[PDB]
Paper text:
The trypsin‐like serine protease plasmin catalyzes the degradation of fibrin clots into soluble fragments, thereby maintaining a normal blood flow in the circulation. Intravascular plasmin is formed from its zymogen [name] after activation by tissue‐type [name] activator (tPA), whereas extravascular plasmin, which contributes to tissue remodeling and cell migration, is mainly produced by the urokinase‐type [name] activator (uPA), especially when bound to its receptor uPAR leading to an enhanced uPA activity. Under physiological conditions, the activity of plasmin is tightly controlled by endogenous inhibitors, the serpin α2‐antiplasmin and by α2‐macroglobulin. Two series of macrocyclic inhibitors addressing the S1 pocket and the prime site of the fibrinolytic serine protease plasmin have been developed.
Numbering used by the authors: 544 to 559, 562 to 791
């Protein structure tokens, strides 16, 4: 009974990270915590293969040395990690060559694929997530007084097409075609500090596909200020090349 990508063994709860709700433990088995060698959380990430983790390039601004990074897998807590939690060192860092906010980490050893550690599925190249598509963002980031501090939280957010997101009342032309927007324009529900590099997944047919990587925003959960995510579809060819070649 191998574990197919995108299919959690613990069905994700829905609560239709600031706002949202604490997730069912192990409902997001591709969620990774990027940590200092001393075990401090400072970014999220997504397991896409037993030996590969995808995150935001900005998460690596403090050090270009792989030895400076540790990956936490199968976790729900941020500080009191449970016993089965896998901790794996990084061997090589691969930054996107067009200066985009995405990067791949090759783990020193392959992660053990369990019912609590399963890779996410990648989208088909150039796929454009439709406007209003409900997707989920996950992370151990700040809650801004919304509850769930120190625990893996989730939030279901509608995707906002770039044409709307780039309007003057919103991000005013700051969003690129290699990026996507997601959030409640009314505010209240949004990724926040510590969620960068983490996943934005959408349910497709019977599984979750990685469509976005938490990147940046004008504050968190502010009205008319949706969060910005790197569009994974525009980088699937590059990601597969790196993994096949290295
Ligand atoms: C070692 C290191 C590596 C990388 C970062 C920080 C450190 N930290 C230090 O260098 C000195 N502190 C230590 O060593 C203690 C290490 C442990 N905790 C900390 O630092 C505290 C800590 C501080 C800051 C962060 C994470 C952790 N994050 C961020 O804000 C990252 N944006 C986002 O999340 C955005 C996502 C989208 C959202 C829009 N809705 C807006 C926010 C941008 C970002 C900024 C900094 C880093 C990573 C990402």
């Amino acid at each position: 009974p191998s574990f197919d990508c995108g299919k959690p063994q613990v069905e994700p709860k829905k609560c239709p990270v600031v706002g949202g709700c604490v997730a069912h433990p192990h409902s997001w088995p591709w969620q990774v915590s990027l940590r200092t060698r001393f075990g401090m959380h400072f970014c999220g990430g997504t397991l896409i293969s037993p030996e590969w983790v995808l995150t935001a390039a900005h998460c690596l601004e403090k050090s270009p040395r792989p030895s400076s990074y540790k990956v936490i897998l199968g976790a729900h807590q941020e500080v009191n990690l449970e016993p089965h939690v896998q901790e794996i060192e990084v061997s090589r860092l691969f930054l996107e060559p067009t200066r985009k906010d995405i990067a791949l980490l090759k783990l020193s050893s392959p992660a053990v694929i369990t019912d609590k550690v399963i890779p996410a599925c990648l989208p088909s190249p150039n796929y454009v997530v439709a406007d209003r598509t409900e997707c989920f963002i996950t992370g151990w980031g700040e809650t801004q007084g919304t509850f769930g501090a120190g625990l893996l939280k989730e939030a279901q957010l509608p995707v906002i097409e770039n044409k709307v997101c780039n309007r003057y009342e919103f991000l005013n032309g700051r969003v690129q075609s290699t990026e996507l927007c997601a959030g409640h324009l009314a505010g209240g529900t949004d990724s926040c500090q510590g969620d960068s590099g983490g996943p934005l997944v959408c349910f497709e047919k019977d599984k979750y596909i990685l469509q976005g990587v938490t990147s940046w925003g004008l504050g968190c959960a502010r009205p008319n200020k949706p969060g910005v995510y790197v569009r994974v579809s525009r980088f699937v060819t590059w990601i597969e090349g790196v993994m096949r070649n290295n």
